[PDB]
DNA sequence: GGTCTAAACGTCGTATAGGAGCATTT
DNA sequence: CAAATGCTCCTATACGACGTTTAGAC
């Protein structure tokens, strides 16, 4: 059985709370809706089953994507309990709070009167990207109810599996640099990119798994470059408290490089050749 | 001077997140 | 009816993931 953890962290980084208001055979004219949601690519729906059996609530599809769906106030009052129990640590966790608060809402059935509808406008107007063109133009002058700003270490090594199942990566860095023998240097990375909202948090992992540098572009990376910083605290911790989903793979081929580099040799044609095969076969390159 | 590692810097194109709205059941 | 939610399709930009140069150790 699957851990919450792991469960929490890969909805902080993949998950989405929604309110849909719709216009509508009904007396504010209006349609008030809750959604909680994860997609992923749909090649890893094994994942869902088993979030889905752990929780016991959520309906799954697959077409373009893999989708588990929490619509029905039963489920929703599930994943409640479960965040609650279990809390999100991202920036997701003020859009959290913005739908729990209309979700109660909606449960007192407030959501029906124009006092109700208006108050939930104001949770939707803060919630991701705010209230429509269409909605702006038909309710004007609303103002949008306060976002907490989320500030937060880390709670548990299954929560880092799964945000960097859902955000992380491994990947293969090739340099054009002719002051080496092969005429490219060969670096295995690791990183997480993030908006810039949270880089407390970025930092506290950085401190959770003792190396890593930042980069800033707006948005953050997390960067590992370091050959024995990947060796010593990377691989192992991914090694005790497993990454999931088909991300794996492409872990176990960056395992493969920093083997290959690990014991020097890429720094040979053949061996840079071997790598770039390998490389070029990860990640986006699969198919 | 040469080889190399770490990481600071640079940047593009699909893949997510977010969304909207009609159909069926309660 | 009307209220909830099942079901499916739409989209556009912030992560992923790829590439180059620099600081400087050995
Ligand atoms: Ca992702
Ligand atoms: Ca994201």
Redesign the pocket.
């Known amino acids: 059985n699957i851990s919450p953890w792991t469960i929490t962290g890969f909805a902080d ?16 004219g209006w ?5 909680f ?1 994860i ?3 749909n090649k890893d729906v094994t994942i869902l089953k088993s979030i889905r059996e752990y929780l016991g609530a959520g ?1 799954i ?1 697959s ?3 893999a ?1 588990i ?8 009052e599930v994943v409640i309990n479960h965040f609650d129990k279990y809390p999100l640590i991202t920036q ?1 966790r003020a ?1 959290y709070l913005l739908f729990k608060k209309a979700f109660y809402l ?1 449960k007192n ?1 407030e ?2 009167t124009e006092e109700g509808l208006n108050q939930i406008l104001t949770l ?1 107007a803060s ?9 702006k133009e038909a309710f004007p002058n609303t103002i949008p109810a306060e976002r907490l700003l989320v500030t937060q270490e880390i709670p548990d090594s299954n929560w880092v599996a799964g945000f960097t199942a ?12 002719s ?4 005429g ?6 690791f ?7 949270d880089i407390e948090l970025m930092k506290n992992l950085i401190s959770y798994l003792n ?7 707006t ?3 997390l ?8 060796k010593e605290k990377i691989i192992p911790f991914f090694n005790k408290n497993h990454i999931i989903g088909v ?1 794996l793979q ?1 872990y176990r081929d960056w395992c493969k490089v920093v083997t290959l ?1 690990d014991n ?1 040799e ?3 044609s053949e061996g840079l050749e071997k790598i770039q095969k390998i ?2 076969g ?5 198919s």
Do not use: W
Not at 31 to 35: E, K
């Open positions: 980084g993949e998950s989405s709370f929604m309110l849909t208001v719709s216009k509508d055979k009904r007396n504010t349609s008030v809706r809750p959604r949601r997609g992923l690519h309906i599809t077409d373009i994507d989708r769906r929490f619509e029905s106030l039963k489920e929703l997701k859009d909606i059935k959501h029906l939707k919630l991701n990207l705010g209230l429509s063109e269409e909605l859902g955000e992380g990566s491994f990947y293969i860095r090739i340099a054009k640099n002051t080496l023998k092969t490219y240097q060969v670096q295995s990375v990183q997480i990119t993030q908006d810039t909202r190396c890593g540098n930042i980069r800033i572009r948005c953050v990376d960067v590992v470059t370091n050959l024995n910083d990947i991300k492409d580099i020097k890429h720094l040979t490389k070029e990860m990640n986006r390159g699969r």
